[PDB]
Amino acid sequence: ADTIVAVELDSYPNTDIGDPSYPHIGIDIKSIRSKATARWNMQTGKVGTAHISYNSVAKRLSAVVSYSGTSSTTVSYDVDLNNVLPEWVRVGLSATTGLYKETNTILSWSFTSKLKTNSLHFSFNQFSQNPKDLILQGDATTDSDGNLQLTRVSSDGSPQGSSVGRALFYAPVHIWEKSAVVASFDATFTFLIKSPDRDPADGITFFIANTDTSIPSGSGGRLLGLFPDAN
Amino acid sequence: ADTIVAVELDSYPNTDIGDPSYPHIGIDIKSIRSKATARWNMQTGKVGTAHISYNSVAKRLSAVVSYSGTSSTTVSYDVDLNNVLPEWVRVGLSATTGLYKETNTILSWSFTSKLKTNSLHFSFNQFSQNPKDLILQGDATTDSDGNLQLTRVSSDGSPQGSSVGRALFYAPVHIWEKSAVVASFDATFTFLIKSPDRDPADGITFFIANTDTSIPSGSGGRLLGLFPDAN
Amino acid sequence: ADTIVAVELDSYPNTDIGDPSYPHIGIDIKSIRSKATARWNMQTGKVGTAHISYNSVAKRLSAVVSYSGTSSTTVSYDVDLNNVLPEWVRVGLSATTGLYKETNTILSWSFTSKLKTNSLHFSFNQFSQNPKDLILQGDATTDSDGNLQLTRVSSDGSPQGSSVGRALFYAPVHIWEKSAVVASFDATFTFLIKSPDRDPADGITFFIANTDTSIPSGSGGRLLGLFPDAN
Amino acid sequence: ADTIVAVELDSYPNTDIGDPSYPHIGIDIKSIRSKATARWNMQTGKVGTAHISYNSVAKRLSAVVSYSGTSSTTVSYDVDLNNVLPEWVRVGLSATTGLYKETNTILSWSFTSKLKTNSLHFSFNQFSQNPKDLILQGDATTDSDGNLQLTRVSSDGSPQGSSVGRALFYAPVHIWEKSAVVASFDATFTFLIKSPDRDPADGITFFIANTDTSIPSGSGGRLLGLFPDAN
Numbered sequence: 001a002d003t004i005v006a007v008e009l010d011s012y013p014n015t016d017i018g019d020p021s022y023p024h025i026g027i028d029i030k031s032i033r034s035k036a037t038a039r040w041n042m043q044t045g046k047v048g049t050a051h052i053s054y055n056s057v058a059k060r061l062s063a064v065v066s067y068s069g070t071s072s073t074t075v076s077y078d079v080d081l082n083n084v085l086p087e088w089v090r091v092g093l094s095a096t097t098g099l100y101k102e103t104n105t106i107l108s109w110s111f112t113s114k115l116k117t118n119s120l121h122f123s124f125n126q127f128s129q130n131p132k133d134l135i136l137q138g139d140a141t142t143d144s145d146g147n148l149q150l151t152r153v154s155s156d157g158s159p160q161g162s163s164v165g166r167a168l169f170y171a172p173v174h175i176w177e178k179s180a181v182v183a184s185f186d187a188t189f190t191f192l193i194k195s196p197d198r199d200p201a202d203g204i205t206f207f208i209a210n211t212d213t214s215i216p217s218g219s220g221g222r223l224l225g226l227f228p229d230a231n
Numbered sequence: 232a233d234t235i236v237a238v239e240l241d242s243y244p245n246t247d248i249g250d251p252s253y254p255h256i257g258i259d260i261k262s263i264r265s266k267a268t269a270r271w272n273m274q275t276g277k278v279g280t281a282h283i284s285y286n287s288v289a290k291r292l293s294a295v296v297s298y299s300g301t302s303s304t305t306v307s308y309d310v311d312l313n314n315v316l317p318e319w320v321r322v323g324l325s326a327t328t329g330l331y332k333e334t335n336t337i338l339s340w341s342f343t344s345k346l347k348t349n350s351l352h353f354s355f356n357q358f359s360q361n362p363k364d365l366i367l368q369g370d371a372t373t374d375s376d377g378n379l380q381l382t383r384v385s386s387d388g389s390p391q392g393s394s395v396g397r398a399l400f401y402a403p404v405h406i407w408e409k410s411a412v413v414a415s416f417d418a419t420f421t422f423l424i425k426s427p428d429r430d431p432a433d434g435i436t437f438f439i440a441n442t443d444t445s446i447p448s449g450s451g452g453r454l455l456g457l458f459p460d461a462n
Numbered sequence: 463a464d465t466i467v468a469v470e471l472d473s474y475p476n477t478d479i480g481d482p483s484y485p486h487i488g489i490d491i492k493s494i495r496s497k498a499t500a501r502w503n504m505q506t507g508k509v510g511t512a513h514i515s516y517n518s519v520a521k522r523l524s525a526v527v528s529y530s531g532t533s534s535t536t537v538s539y540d541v542d543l544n545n546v547l548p549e550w551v552r553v554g555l556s557a558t559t560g561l562y563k564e565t566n567t568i569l570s571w572s573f574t575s576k577l578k579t580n581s582l583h584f585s586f587n588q589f590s591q592n593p594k595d596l597i598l599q600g601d602a603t604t605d606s607d608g609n610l611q612l613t614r615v616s617s618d619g620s621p622q623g624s625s626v627g628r629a630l631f632y633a634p635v636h637i638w639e640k641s642a643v644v645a646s647f648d649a650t651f652t653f654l655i656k657s658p659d660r661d662p663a664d665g666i667t668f669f670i671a672n673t674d675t676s677i678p679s680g681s682g683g684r685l686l687g688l689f690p691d692a693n
Numbered sequence: 694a695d696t697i698v699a700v701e702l703d704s705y706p707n708t709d710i711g712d713p714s715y716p717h718i719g720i721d722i723k724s725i726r727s728k729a730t731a732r733w734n735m736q737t738g739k740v741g742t743a744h745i746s747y748n749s750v751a752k753r754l755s756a757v758v759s760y761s762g763t764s765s766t767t768v769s770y771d772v773d774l775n776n777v778l779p780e781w782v783r784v785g786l787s788a789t790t791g792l793y794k795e796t797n798t799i800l801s802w803s804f805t806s807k808l809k810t811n812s813l814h815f816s817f818n819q820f821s822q823n824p825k826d827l828i829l830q831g832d833a834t835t836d837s838d839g840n841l842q843l844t845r846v847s848s849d850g851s852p853q854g855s856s857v858g859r860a861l862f863y864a865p866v867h868i869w870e871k872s873a874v875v876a877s878f879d880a881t882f883t884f885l886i887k888s889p890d891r892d893p894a895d896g897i898t899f900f901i902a903n904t905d906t907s908i909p910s911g912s913g914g915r916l917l918g919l920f921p922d923a924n
């Protein structure tokens with residue numbers, strides 16, 4: 001199967017596959033069962049911001065998720081990613097709904113990777129109706145306001161359940177190379193999660209995988225479109 | 232056929248299809264017959280640097296080609312590129328040999344595009360043996376020193392004639408959009424041209440084209456791998 | 463006196479010192495009497511954006527000023543700036559009021575300069591209460607919302623007349639050097655101009671000058687805090 | 694006195710004030726007695742490269758120092774720098790000689806800081822004869838090849854003992870702010886250390902301090918121009 005590293009913004013607690021009993025942000029290394037989590041004061045209807053960073057010297061993957069004036073949650077995990085990930089990757093965003101639902105609207109997304117002794121940076125502050133520099137998978141679409149709807153939304157804006165969708169950047173990324181002195185990446189995205197459900201679900205991830213990654217069978221709902229099971 | 236905008240570093244004068252009678256840099260808008268040229272004091276065996284820039288407000292495509300301490304040549308052309316190019320493009324480098332030959336060795340290549348009211352930047356200071364973020368066309372390869380050999384070079388380093396090769400960046404680039412306030416791009420590459428021929432040929436280009444661009448039939452030699460004829 | 467290059471957003475027509483009879487954007491080379499202007503559909507109470515760019519190869523200073531969904535005005539002028547400006551400069555923003563007034567509120571400001579063969583970039587999306595990386599001149603202050611008020615505003619937000627204020631970046635900028643292949647700069651700022659006056663005044667500039675530049679005597683009002691007279 | 698955070702490239706072992714018994718790179722938090730060190734295979738006469746990074750989420754200051762094809766040494770230290778440093782800082786490079794000597798030649802220096810919810814980046818690949826964007830302290834000069842000589846070098850290139858010199862960037866840097874979601878910085882410099890001494894000394898640092906920082910009295914030699922004593 002795919003090799004996966006992800007930062008999950010998990011709005012629904014699936015305690016039966018390892019979630020804490022509350023909304024949380026998590027660092028996922030090849031398993032939906034996060035190696036590290038932090039409690040997420042998830043706000044429906046307000047725009048959030050996530051920042052993710054890593055470098056091969058400090059070897060500490062970190063993420064912070066914030067709502068302006070409201071809250072900020074941070075999670076870190078010490079991991080040598082050059083030991084987990086292949087040399088060439090694609091980076092992306094994923095989102096699911098399940099029994100319960102939410103909009104998983106991406107308003108912006110940027111990413112930088114550096115291979116020091118290669119550089120790649122992209123920034124999207126609007127998404128075009130046919131984004132030729134993105135690989136849209138599952139239900140992911142871009143809409144009339146220029147936003148990226150990772151999961152299905154009806155004509156009036158209502159989120160639908162049992163949705164899975166992902167967007168990967170078109171170009172493979174060279175995230176490590178044996179002659180590199182240091183490899184680093186940074187990622188930021190802003191997101192709007194709306195829901196009429198008392199318990200919204202399921203969440204959004206930023207993720208790095210093998211370049212030929214695709215939505216695994218059975219990855220809906222709590223598996224965030226990333227893993228075929230909860231191992 | 233393809234839609235082409237290019238800056239050509241033309242080491243061989245083909246006076247019969249419009250070249251001036253000397254090595255020159257040129258700005259090409261949909262024809263190998265440059266809309267503007269400047270005399271190029273082409274230096275065999277020394278590393279050169281080319282800088283190209285454009286923005287949709289000034290509407291002036293410019294290029295400068297230099298050898299440290301030796302020479303610098305500049306050419307500009309006033310053109311609304313949003314009137315020439317499709318909204319989505321790929322960017323690349325091309326090179327040819329013909330009867331006469333030269334190495335067309337790319338040591339580095341960078342590019343930035345901005346869509347203001349989208350950003351894309353890539354930088355290569357070394358090229359890996361299998362560059363998954365590049366579309367290599369024709370004879371283009373990367374070699375053991377980490378350089379990009381656009382045209383065929385033998386085992387010992389000798390350039391071969393009748394070669395054509397191109398390298399495009401993998402991801403389409405969004406170079407204009409009707410809601411943009413301003414669109415801009417910048418490109419830099421460094422290059423080493425070696426030749427045992429008294430009159431080296433044929434040259435190197437940086438070029439922007441339709442995303443599905445490929446080497447046209449009959450584009451070798453003086454056509455720089457860009458055009459199917461000299462119209 | 464100072465040596466000045468500026469892009470002026472001139473909200474008040476002073477026809478007696480060379481203004482066209484309407485709000486305009488202008489390119490100023492050592493004189494308030496613009497070398498080039500374009501009609502500016504100036505909008506009171508809406509946030510505007512200005513983009514300015516130049517490179518020493520194309521030698522074309524350009525500016526675009528826009529309100530989202532409303533209007534965009536562009537002005538360009540062909541000028542070799544390395545022939546006007548000293549090698550070391552400071553860059554800044556200026557604004558005035560006079561008999562008539564307006565707020566000259568800077569919401570953001572960024573700038574990049576490149577000296578190719580040096581790089582400097584700064585970006586402000588919020589201004590702190592005591593910006594130690596800015597030289598504030600005249601009436602310029604930063605306020606509680608994190609904005610830069612170039613001209614005097616009363617406690618409730620009312621703009622005052624007979625105000626002059628400027629903000630320069632602290633560090634001198636190396637905008638040309640005789641060994642450079644190409645020198646380039648880019649600048650963006652966003653601005654909010656509010657006024658209860660039927661004819662608001664006087665305007666905002668982005669400007670480059672000798673590093674020891676200061677507000678000239680008698681530069682208020684129509685002189686935009688840049689020039690001691692209307693020569 | 695000054696508040697100091699530094700990464701030291703310490704070519705001389707002063708075991709009597711806490712150095713390990715070998716050349717080392719070290720992370721210094723308000724004391725020359727490094728909180729963390731790693732053995733440095735210091736190479737005389739070859740160009741080295743140092744990369745330093747930190748972000749306020751991972752809270753891990755890291756540094757890697759390398760010679761191409763030869764060696765690489767890494768040191769990290771977990772520290773909340775927003776708890777050590779004032780909100781406004783200057784960043785710089787320092788170097789000393791003492792009884793023993795070496796050239797402390799800076800060939801390039803770059804730095805980025807980001808204040809997320811401010812950006813500052815500078816890059817020097819050549820240093821001009823009178824760098825107006827640098828505060829040169831002590832013996833620091835720039836020479837005819839465009840390099841930064843932090844410590845005294847004679848007319849022919851011979852390093853002198855009992856030298857101290859520093860170069861700070863002119864503009865204060867805003868490295869933390871109470872409303873920031875995350876603060877980050879990155880720094881790179883390349884350096885050439887030549888010596889006719891069997892045991893070269895004393896070393897080079899990249900350092901962050903109070904904006905009004907100056908060379909303390911008695912900071913020569915093993916104190917690297919940063920501290921007034923070895924507490």
Ligand SMILES: OC[C@H]1O[C@H](Oc2c[nH]c3ccc(Br)c(Cl)c23)[C@@H](O)[C@@H](O)[C@@H]1O
Binds near residue numbers: 014098099220221222
């Ligand atoms: O969308 C949230 C969740 O909905 C389903 O799980 C349930 C949440 N509440 C329930 C109540 C009953 C059943 Br049966 C299920 Cl399967 C659930 C599944 O789709 C999960 O994958 C998902 O995490």
Ligand SMILES: OC[C@H]1O[C@H](Oc2c[nH]c3ccc(Br)c(Cl)c23)[C@@H](O)[C@@H](O)[C@@H]1O
Binds near residue numbers: 243329451452
């Ligand atoms: O490589 C340089 C040139 O070589 C060929 O043209 C000639 C240059 N000198 C010649 C002499 C004879 C003939 Br026949 C040709 Cl076709 C040439 C052709 O391959 C040209 O496309 C190319 O520009």
Ligand SMILES: OC[C@H]1O[C@H](Oc2c[nH]c3ccc(Br)c(Cl)c23)[C@@H](O)[C@@H](O)[C@@H]1O
Binds near residue numbers: 476559563682683685
């Ligand atoms: O603020 C707009 C203008 O106000 C003054 O000029 C006038 C605009 N309408 C007037 C009417 C009368 C007189 Br007297 C003046 Cl001086 C003006 C002067 O302060 C000008 O410098 C400025 O351009």
Ligand SMILES: OC[C@H]1O[C@H](Oc2c[nH]c3ccc(Br)c(Cl)c23)[C@@H](O)[C@@H](O)[C@@H]1O
Binds near residue numbers: 792894
């Ligand atoms: O330059 C290297 C060192 O030279 C001096 O220390 C000595 C190194 N070998 C010695 C031998 C004798 C004496 Br006395 C001294 Cl003070 C030293 C002092 O200047 C030290 O600060 C410095 O670390």
Ligand SMILES: [Ca+2]
Binds near residue numbers: 010013019222
């Ligand atoms: Ca879950």
Ligand SMILES: [Ca+2]
Binds near residue numbers: 453
């Ligand atoms: Ca030719």
Ligand SMILES: [Ca+2]
Binds near residue numbers: 472473474476481664
């Ligand atoms: Ca006026």
Ligand SMILES: [Ca+2]
Binds near residue numbers: 705
């Ligand atoms: Ca020491």
Ligand SMILES: [Mn+2]
Binds near residue numbers: 010024026
């Ligand atoms: Mn979870």
Ligand SMILES: [Mn+2]
Binds near residue numbers: 239250265
């Ligand atoms: Mn030609």
Ligand SMILES: [Mn+2]
Binds near residue numbers: 470482
């Ligand atoms: Mn005017």
Ligand SMILES: [Mn+2]
Binds near residue numbers: 703712713717719727
């Ligand atoms: Mn030490």
